[PDB]
């Protein structure tokens, strides 16, 4: 069972923090019962629910920071794209498509014509 992320996403951060601390209290109360009982499979659901609550809290905070840094250069490095080191160091499309004005004049004057050959 456990908690559901889509219904966790509608709450505020204080309710999420309180739900997290009651989940941790429940996990401690199950861990003190695990030593007396032979098996206790209910611990795994509480563990995964704690993971779900932490994931929702982190994604809410990260989205708030993204909207704070929206529409400006120099956003933080973990928020900007990852792809690879070489693709990050590669030239952008604008810089790669930069051409001299002399070559631009030559390309406008003499572009590669489309032609066919029968008649």
């Amino acid at each position: 069972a456990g908690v559901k992320a889509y219904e966790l996403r509608t709450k505020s951060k204080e309710q999420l923090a309180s739900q997290l601390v009651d989940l941790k209290k429940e996990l401690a109360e199950l861990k003190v019962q695990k030593l007396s009982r032979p098996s206790l499979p209910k611990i795994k659901t509480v563990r995964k629910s704690i993971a779900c609550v932490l994931t929702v809290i982190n994604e809410q905070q990260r989205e708030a920071v993204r909207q704070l840094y929206k529409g400006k250069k120099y956003q933080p490095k973990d928020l900007r794209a990852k792809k690879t080191r070489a693709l990050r160091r590669a030239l952008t499309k604008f810089e790669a498509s930069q051409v001299t004005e002399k070559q631009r004049k030559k390309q406008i004057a003499f572009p590669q014509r489309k032609y066919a050959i029968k008649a």
Binding site: F110, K114, Y115, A116, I117, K118
Partner: protein
């Protein structure tokens, strides 16, 4: 070592020659991929004939000067006599060689005539509009064969 009446052999296999052995197992697959590359290039340049027009030109040495063959590109003097600039000829599909010269009037006249027939045979499309599709041929060399005089 040396033995019965046999010719003296010179087999150069005293290095680690087995480290450099190229067996062309990929002849058939390389031919297939080569035809695939030709077809996709033709589809990419879908009206244009896949190769430029080459001049007729006289082969260099005394062993081969009896024959005539294809050159790299036309002389600037040849394209000026044909009546079009070198940049325009390069855009409409004529190979231009800036570094060969004309010392032979027969070769010059043959190349000028060859350019005249090419300009008569091609259709140049307008740069903006209708593009009246015209069912490409794939070999300007086959449509303009090199003829021995």
């Amino acid at each position: 070592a040396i033995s019965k009446n046999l010719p003296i052999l010179k087999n150069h296999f005293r290095k680690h020659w087995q480290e450099r052995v190229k067996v062309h197992f990929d002849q058939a697959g390389k031919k297939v991929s080569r035809r695939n590359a030709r077809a996709t290039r033709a589809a990419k340049i879908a009206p244009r004939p896949l190769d430029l027009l080459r001049p007729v030109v006289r082969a260099p040495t005394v062993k081969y000067n009896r024959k005539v063959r294809a050159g790299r590109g036309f002389t600037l003097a040849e394209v000026k006599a044909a009546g079009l600039t070198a940049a325009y000829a390069r855009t409409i599909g004529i190979a231009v060689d800036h570094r060969r010269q004309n010392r032979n009037q027969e070769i010059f006249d043959a190349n000028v005539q060859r350019l005249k027939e090419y300009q008569s045979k091609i259709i140049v499309f307008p740069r903006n509009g209708k593009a009246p599709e015209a069912e490409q041929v794939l070999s300007a060399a086959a449509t303009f064969p090199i003829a021995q005089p």
